[PDB]
Write a protein that binds this ligand. Structure first.
Ligand SMILES: C[N+](C)(C)[C@@H](Cc1cnc[nH]1)C(=O)O
Ligand SMILES: [Mn+2]
Ligand code: NA
Length: 449
């Protein structure tokens, strides 16, 4: 048994994006985000920015709606917006290098009332639904079709369901209410031995073809052949129990496992353990979305990139993280691979659970290479600076989606998490974050020999 009462619709091929199917997918995208945002009990909590590097929650309540409107205006499927001031106020978010830069940016913003932003959402929903009902869906949809703006808006909303869930997780438990049917994975369980598996080397082609019949973001496209040498990777994501051993061996107290930049981050934030653990009465509790529970020892540990690399430092002996090409080889092999959307059901993706799961519990989630949960459970960090593939081109609808972040200051992560939905659960999505940032994200370890 797994989570069932809250359901996320699978993504749809562009050749099957009929008006009726898209109506259902749109309604589901929006209702899911509504369920998440309604879990905040008190409206005053929307003026908190629980992550010090992101905007207050009120911004994210409006932003998904404003983005749909702004892109539909840009392709001229909408002749006017709903509230021009809000379309500007909620237009774009933030990716600051530090909390002081963000604090300076948000210091003098007059935010609307929570009820006014909910009213904006409800009006936007009805305006977009009417656009859908009054537009011909001439199959197939594609990147030069006006309806690309709608496809982009729905994936953007599902991405913000995921990133907003990480903000609500940073609120105190007394400030949020678990939605009916939210179901965590089973949590008792000591981890099994995490064996190193030889991944046979081969050649991969990274990227996505322009006429592939699936919505994707600009940075997904291009074509890059990479020869990948054989390498060893741990069959499981590193677990909470494995990371607890690192803590007990003074992992956060030993400079040689860190570097000057990551140690500085650790000291500045007085970090002694992963973000969502707390030590009390001699033992660690763990913060799931809405509840504190005993630390689930066999779940994948959730860390930022700095902490993943510090664990690699403790392992020593050339222990490292995979590259993007190495993850692709392990997850999809060397094959014109035809995505099968139904396979999303085989991994802890798309709200199969409302939490990470024990490594290996989902019995269909072993890739052919032998590695477990390459797809799903938690994103996994990669030692790969976010970068374009040959053939990359920004899209007119969102020219700065990815180009600003090809800056050697963002590391990549791939594969999707329990909370990931839409085309972000499939092969081509490329994800990236500053290395100090927290997501529903872990890692596995690699050695060359
Ligand atoms: C690709 N990530 C997940 C890093 C992006 C997704 C995104 C949201 N709005 C525009 N892009 C981010 O969170 O900034
Ligand atoms: Mn956004
Ligand atoms: Na994964």
């Amino acid at each position: 048994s797994h989570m069932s009462f809250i359901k996320s619709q699978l993504p749809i091929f562009l050749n099957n994006c009929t008006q009726d199917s898209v109506i259902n997918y749109f309604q589901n995208s929006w209702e899911l985000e509504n369920i998440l945002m309604r879990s905040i009990i008190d409206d005053e909590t929307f003026y908190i920015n629980p992550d010090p590097l992101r905007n207050p929650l009120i911004f994210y309540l409006g932003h998904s709606a404003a983005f749909y409107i702004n892109k539909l205006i840009r392709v001229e499927l909408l002749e006017k917006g709903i509230n021009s001031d809000y379309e500007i106020l909620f237009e774009f978010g933030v990716d600051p290098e530090n909390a002081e830069e963000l604090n300076q940016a948000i210091a003098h913003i007059n935010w609307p009332d929570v009820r006014q932003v909910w009213d904006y959402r409800n009006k936007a929903y009805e305006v977009i639904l009417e656009v859908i009902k009054n537009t011909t869906f001439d199959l197939p949809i594609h990147a030069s079709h006006p309806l690309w703006a709608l496809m982009m808006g729905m994936e953007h909303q599902r991405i913000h369901f995921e990133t907003s869930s990480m903000l609500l997780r940073q609120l105190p438990t007394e400030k949020v209410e678990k939605p009916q049917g939210w179901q965590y994975a089973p949590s008792q369980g000591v981890p099994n031995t995490n064996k190193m598996i030889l991944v046979e080397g081969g050649t991969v082609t990274l990227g996505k073809a322009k006429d592939n019949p699936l919505y994707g973001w600009d940075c997904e496209y291009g074509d890059r052949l990479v020869k990948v040498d054989s390498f060893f990777a741990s069959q499981y994501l590193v677990t909470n129990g494995e990371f607890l051993e690192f803590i007990n061996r003074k992992g956060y107290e030993t400079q040689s496992y860190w570097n000057e930049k990551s140690w500085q981050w650790k000291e500045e934030n007085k970090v002694k353990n992963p973000k969502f653990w707390q030590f009390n009465n001699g033992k660690y509790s763990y913060r799931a979305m809405f509840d504190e529970i005993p630390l689930p020892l066999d779940w994948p540990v959730e860390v930022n990139y700095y902490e993943a690399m510090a664990y690699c430092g403790w392992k020593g002996k050339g222990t490292r993280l995979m590259s993007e090409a190495e993850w692709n080889l392990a997850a999809y092999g060397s094959n014109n691979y035809q995505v099968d959307i139904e396979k999303v059901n085989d991994y802890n993706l798309n709200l199969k659970f409302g939490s990470p799961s024990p490594v290996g519990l989902v019995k269909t989630a072993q890739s052919h290479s032998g590695l477990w949960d390459l797809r799903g459970n938690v994103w996994e960090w990669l030692d790969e600076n976010f970068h374009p593939l040959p053939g990359f081109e920004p899209h007119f609808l969102y020219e700065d989606n990815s180009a600003p972040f090809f800056d050697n200051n963002h590391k990549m992560m791939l594969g999707g998490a329990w909370v990931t939905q839409g085309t972000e659960t499939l092969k081509y999505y490329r994800n990236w974050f500053r290395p100090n940032f927290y997501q529903h994200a872990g890692f596995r370890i690699v050695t060359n020999h």
